[PDB]
Amino acid sequence: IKEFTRFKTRTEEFSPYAWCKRMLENDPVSYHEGTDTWNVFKYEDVKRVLSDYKHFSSVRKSVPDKIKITEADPPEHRKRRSLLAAAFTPRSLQNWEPRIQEIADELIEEMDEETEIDIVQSLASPLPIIVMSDLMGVPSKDRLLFKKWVDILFLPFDKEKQEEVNELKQVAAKEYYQYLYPIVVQKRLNPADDIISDLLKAEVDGEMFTDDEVVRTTMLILGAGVETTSHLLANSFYSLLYDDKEVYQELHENLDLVPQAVEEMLRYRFNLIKLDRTVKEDNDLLGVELKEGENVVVWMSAANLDEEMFEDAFTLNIHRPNNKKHLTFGNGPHFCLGAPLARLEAKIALTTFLKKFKHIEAVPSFQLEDNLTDSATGQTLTSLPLKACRTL
Numbered sequence: 001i002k003e004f005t006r007f008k009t010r011t012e013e014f015s016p017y018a019w020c021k022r023m024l025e026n027d028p029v030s031y032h033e034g035t036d037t038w039n040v041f042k043y044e045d046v047k048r049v050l051s052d053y054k055h056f057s058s059v060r061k062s063v064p065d066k067i068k069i070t071e072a073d074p075p076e077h078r079k080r081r082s083l084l085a086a087a088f089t090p091r092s093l094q095n096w097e098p099r100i101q102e103i104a105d106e107l108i109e110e111m112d113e114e115t116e117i118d119i120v121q122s123l124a125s126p127l128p129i130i131v132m133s134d135l136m137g138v139p140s141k142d143r144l145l146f147k148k149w150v151d152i153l154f155l156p157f158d159k160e161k162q163e164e165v166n167e168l169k170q171v172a173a174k175e176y177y178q179y180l181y182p183i184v185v186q187k188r189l190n191p192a193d194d195i196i197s198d199l200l201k202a203e204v205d206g207e208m209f210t211d212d213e214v215v216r217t218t219m220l221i222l223g224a225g226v227e228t229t230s231h232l233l234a235n236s237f238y239s240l241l242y243d244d245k246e247v248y249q250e251l252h253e254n255l256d257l258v259p260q261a262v263e264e265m266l267r268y269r270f271n272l273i274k275l276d277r278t279v280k281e282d283n284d285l286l287g288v289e290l291k292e293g294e295n296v297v298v299w300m301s302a303a304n305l306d307e308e309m310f311e312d313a314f315t316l317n318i319h320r321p322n323n324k325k326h327l328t329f330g331n332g333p334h335f336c337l338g339a340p341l342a343r344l345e346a347k348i349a350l351t352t353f354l355k356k357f358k359h360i361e362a363v364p365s366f367q368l369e370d371n372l373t374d375s376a377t378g379q380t381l382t383s384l385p386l387k388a389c390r391t392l
């Protein structure tokens with residue numbers, strides 16, 4: 001990432017609109033000598049690379065093998081995805097809503113009007129983690145223990161840390177495994193409505209998981225869904241405090257708008273997300289002769305800001321007809337399997353908050369350049385304080 005983007009400040013990277021703008025207009029398909037990648041930005045072209053597995057492929061450049069789902073095209077992808085999709089059935093999802101609600105209620109009841117609330121510390125970070133501990137079937141008594149390891153492994157470093165992180169991660173990995181494996185063993189014998197039990201009962205094309213593979217699969221799932229869901233929640237409150245005064249009140253008066261607002265956040269405020277493909281059959285299609293083996297990186301963050309697809313692309317507009325056509329969850333066969341959940345967590349989180357709080361206020365003293373740390377998405381809020389106002 002760093003070797004191509006090169007932002008002078010953390011604030012530039014948290015809000016990279018100008019950079020996306022100028023790439024979309026002045027360099028929509030740029031080669032980069034220093035990393036040996038092509039770089040695609042336009043919406044129609046990004047969508048073509050993500051979906052056309054035949055010309056652009058997910059095979060490229062420990063994790064079970066039968067579940068390296070990202071790293072396979074049709075037709076062997078179908079096997080890997082069906083295997084994992086056993087834990088993400090519409091039945092489970094239906095059951096998850098009330099359990100996601102209770103957790104949201106607990107966290108929001110714990111916030112008080114009188115003080116400044118830190119949204120990252122008190123909602124954006126713990127909700128995805130507490131949620132995933134629940135849907136996994138970790139006992140509530142061990143929830144805080146789970147959170148300790150999930151933090152370290154999966155939440156964007158701490159603020160000040162270095163390469164002794166790699167050692168801290170290695171330990172958390174070892175302790176997580178020690179902790180979870182016996183729960184997997186016990187759910188093999190005595191199953192319940194949770195991801196672990198469903199992964200154990202999964203059979204697809206004569207493949208079943210070992211207990212060890214189930215454990216490593218939960219790490220995959222946490223690794224896919226915690227940083228990302230945390231980031232969406234954080235940036236959703238960021239946007240409500242700084243991008244448009246009125247949007248909060250608007251949602252407060254019409255709670256049926258929350259899902260649209262989530263979609264507009266995925267479009268406009270899920271910044272720097274990108275994906276990788278390798279070329280497997282030569283083509284123009286983009287308007288440059290690409291050869292097999294070259295690395296195409298796509299920048300969905302930018303695609304989501306292409307004026308061709310989105311009217312007033314650089315403006316937070318929750319009423320824009322086609323917000324939901326954003327590429328933040330991908331497109332084509334690899335479309336985020338966790339989208340239903342992620343959309344669900346965000347709707348519940350926001351809705352529950354809006355029901356308790358009529359107004360929110362940004363703290364004048366808040367310096368955005370402090371309070372940002374490096375991550376897989378670019379930068380990410382380590383803190384976000386607000387003042388809020390009870391009832392209606």
Ligand code: HEM
Pocket residue numbers: 069070081084221224225226228229232270275276327328329330331333334335336337338339341342
């Ligand atoms: C805001 C939240 C999230 C975003 C923006 C997001 C985004 C994405 C994107 C862009 C991909 C496509 C990867 C590719 O094409 O190479 C993807 C794949 C995936 N995501 Fe997510 N994700 C989110 C949350 C989750 C959650 C919560 C889970 C699981 C609980 C999850 C599980 C997955 C899985 C398994 C895949 C791979 C599916 C496949 O290759 O067939 N994600 N995600």
